[model samples]
Target: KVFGRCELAAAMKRHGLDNYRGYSLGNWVCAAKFESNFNTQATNRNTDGSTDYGILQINSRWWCNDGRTPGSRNLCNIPCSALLSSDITASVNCAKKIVSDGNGMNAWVAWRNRCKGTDVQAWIRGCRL
Candidate 1:
């Protein structure tokens, strides 16, 4: 499912993305803006044959088990199919694992290039949170 900006913000906030491991909610908001445009079912295949899945675009190579990535770690211990669900619980959980594993928000180039070192407050502004 696609989400409105605030709709996704409030959802992720409740799932604990707000200041999760020192990354602000705005960071996530901006990441999603560029990554998948708040799409829960987005998928992007990489040149390495790995694919990014879901809103946070968790990777098939190191995060979810797509059974296509050669050396998938499945660190999130979830199938990539689950990440596409509109529920978002699995997506949020996987994203947290990515952060806790030390990648921070750099796991997605979109965040590093667009969301980082910038005024991201507007990403979460007007959310009424």
Candidate 2:
């Protein structure tokens, strides 16, 4: 489905991004490929019992650092199952924010440089968006 800017923006916010102009669709898709294989509903259990959830593979215990319960308002509350509920653009935008904010394009570039190739890496390298 066609995702709108508002949905994209919300996804960005959910992923802890204060800005959204330094990422691209390719970068986002790549992160999805690596993190969750584009499966937004994916959730993983860390060896320590914490959970990494959602399309961005958000470590709810880490990013949602409000000290509140998982479903509390202070936390992300957006369960992994609901991540794919949003449109494609929204999911992509969310992934962008996660990559850019958490690791920056360098990390994306590094991943591509090692795993994919420079051409795929170029989509986000040095890009402000």
Candidate 3:
């Protein structure tokens, strides 16, 4: 689904993401923007040959298993297809799993390279939430 920035932020917050679970809302929003620009159906093929799924780009190698993907840790117990949804329920939950039990946004190269030190106020400037 094509979620505008503000709409996406609200959805995340409504699901308990606003500054909860040890990550700043800014960090979450920034990662989401850089990772997939709020597109829930986004997918990427990494150079390491793993596939990344959904807005958070949860990786096939560690997060979820696409039947074709082998050797996944599958820590989230969800399929890669589970991330491709309009609901974003699994996507948000899986992302939180990484933040709590996995890497702290460092799981995503985009968070480290793009969102970590940038001015994030602009990411949700008019969202006001």
Candidate 1: worst 10 consecutive residues by lDDT?
99-108
Q: What does candidate 2 score on TM?
A: 0.48
Q: How many pairs collide in each candidate, listed in order?
A: 0, 4, 0
Q: Give lDDT tens digits, candidate 1, residues 1-129.
A: 999999999999999889999988999989998999999989999999999998988889888898889977888999999999989899999898898887778888999999999999898888888
Off by over 4 Å in 2: 1-21, 64-81, 84-102, 105-117, 121-129
Per-candidate TM equals 0.96, 0.48, 0.91
Estimate the overall C-alpha local distance difference test score of candidate 2. 0.47
Q: Candidate 2's residue-wise lDDT over 1-129, tens digit each?
A: 223334433444455443345544444445555666555566677665555655555554544332433552313334444445544433444445445465565434334554344344443345343
Local accuracy of candidate 3 as per-residue lDDT tens digits, 73-123? 888999898998989889988887888865677878899999887887677
Residue 10, candidate 1: alpha-carbon lDDT: 95
Q: Specify the highest-TM-score model's number.
A: 1
Give the C-alpha lDDT of model 3: 0.84
Q: Rank order by lDDT, top first?
A: 1, 3, 2
Q: What RMSD, rounded to one decimal, does every model reach?
A: 0.8, 7.7, 1.5
Off by over 4 Å in 1: none
